Design a protein around this ligand. Sequence first.
Ligand SMILES: [Mg+2]
Lengths: 127, 126, 127
Amino acid sequence: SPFFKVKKLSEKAVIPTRGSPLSAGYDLSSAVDSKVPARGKALIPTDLSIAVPEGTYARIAPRSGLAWKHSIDVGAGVIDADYRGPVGVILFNHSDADFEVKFGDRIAQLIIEKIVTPDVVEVDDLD
Amino acid sequence: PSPFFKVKKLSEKAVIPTRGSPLSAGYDLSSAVDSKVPARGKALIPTDLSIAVPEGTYARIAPRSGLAWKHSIDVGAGVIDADYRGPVGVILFNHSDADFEVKFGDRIAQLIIEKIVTPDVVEVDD
Amino acid sequence: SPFFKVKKLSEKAVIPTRGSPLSAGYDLSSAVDSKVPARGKALIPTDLSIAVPEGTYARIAPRSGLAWKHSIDVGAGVIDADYRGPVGVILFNHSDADFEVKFGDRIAQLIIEKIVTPDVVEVDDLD
Ligand SMILES: [Mg+2]
């Protein structure tokens, strides 16, 4: 049984929702207004904590709009299934234009990616 | 299901994406146009393809390794839903101080069909 | 049955390890002293070769601390299940300060992502 458990850390938090029926990702909204300086970065809180199943992780993935319109990309974004701290989104601004994130703007989408995690076998030949 | 990958050409410039080694993750994507990705800038490179991938996956537009080292090229955005039937364009960021030229038919990215889970969003206090 | 095979290519390589039971990734360490120049890139050798199962790839993925503290991002990062050459991490530096890497520094994390690789078919009409 897959699951996506979400805890609001604030009254500011928006519960993530999927944008199309067969959408890969749950949209993540900013819990703050924040500058993202030209050629710099910002750490935007979501005011959520999450849990996802073992055998998956939550990837905070970029939105196509912020990227193509504002040259905004998402850094880091690997949220382990046992990570219970608050979810923040790191944004990089790859343009000479200051940008600003507004409270409640969708800044990323969370994608619950299937993975495997076997124990490493060291070999002298990989075959 | 049975997984599948259907592509529809939107012009005769589109190239059928193909894999590159039998256990290969990704299907090479070719540019449909002559264009460029400016130094320290960005471009949308059309593929002239529309695609379908199975429910419980998405198509990730992912960077080629050769272009990353040689041109400082990275893919922006790149999340194509199993739902999406519009044209597929590749957002490229150029993290160097020289323009990156693209000719029609060059490989500018690779598409990976990643398995995902899509449950309902269950709010808690944990 | 998933596996993760690793071959050391020198005594400078470190076997990737997972932080917690539910960690998505295996930490990767630099086999070299190097640097990522301000606004530039580097290829950092791992001195590893690897093999992962058919139906997966190894994604080279970013550490969040490095993203936030140093504006470090991972470029490239798609390692095919049948790629048997040396694993190098490409790093982009989205700040104006050079980033030093010391031999044994953790520079990325490896995630073994589940995928499908069906036979592509061109069609006249989409579903
Ligand atoms: Mg992925």
